[PDB]
C-alpha cells in the first residue's frame, strides 16, 4: 500500500473532537452540566455525521466531474441529498 493509504487511515482512526468544546456546547444548552459518557457518545455520533457528509459530498464532486478537495458547493449539495434521503436530521 501507499504511505497515503496508511496515513489516511491513521487520521481516520484517531480523528476526534476535543471533549472540552463538545461539553461546553452541550452544557450551554441544557444549563445543567453533563457527564463524561454523554460527551463521548455525542462525539462518536458527530463523527459519524461528519463521515456521512464527507462521503456524500465526495460523491457529488465525483459526479459533477470534479476532483477533491471538497468545495463548499459540494458540502451544501450533499446536505440537501442527505435530507431528501431523510438520513440526516
Amino acid at each position: 500500500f501507499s504511505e497515503e493509504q496508511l496515513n489516511r487511515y491513521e487520521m481516520y482512526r484517531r480523528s476526534a473532537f476535543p471533549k472540552a468544546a463538545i461539553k461546553r456546547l452541550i452544557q450551554s444548552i441544557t444549563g445543567t452540566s453533563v457527564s463524561q459518557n454523554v460527551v463521548i457518545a455525542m462525539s462518536g455520533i458527530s463523527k459519524v455525521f461528519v463521515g456521512e457528509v464527507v462521503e456524500e459530498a465526495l460523491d457529488v464532486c465525483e459526479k459533477w466531474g470534479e476532483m477533491p478537495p471538497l468545495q463548499p458547493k459540494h458540502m451544501r449539495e450533499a446536505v440537501r441529498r442527505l435530507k431528501s434521503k431523510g438520513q440526516i436530521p
Binding site: 476526534a16 456546547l25 478537495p69 458540502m75
Partner: protein
C-alpha cells in the same frame, strides 16, 4: 472550536490531504447545528 480535528477527519474520510478552509468551516457550522439538534431532541426523549 474544532478545525484541525475536523481537517484530519475529512481527510480520514476521503477528502484531499489538505482540504479547503471555506469547506472546513461550513462543516463546523453543520456539526454545531447537528449537536444542538440532538441535544434538544435528547432533552425531550
Amino acid at each position: 472550536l474544532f478545525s484541525k480535528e475536523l481537517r484530519c477527519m475529512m481527510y480520514g474520510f476521503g477528502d484531499d490531504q489538505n482540504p479547503y478552509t471555506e469547506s472546513v468551516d461550513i462543516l463546523e457550522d453543520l456539526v454545531i447545528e447537528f449537536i444542538t439538534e440532538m441535544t434538544h431532541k435528547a432533552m425531550s426523549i
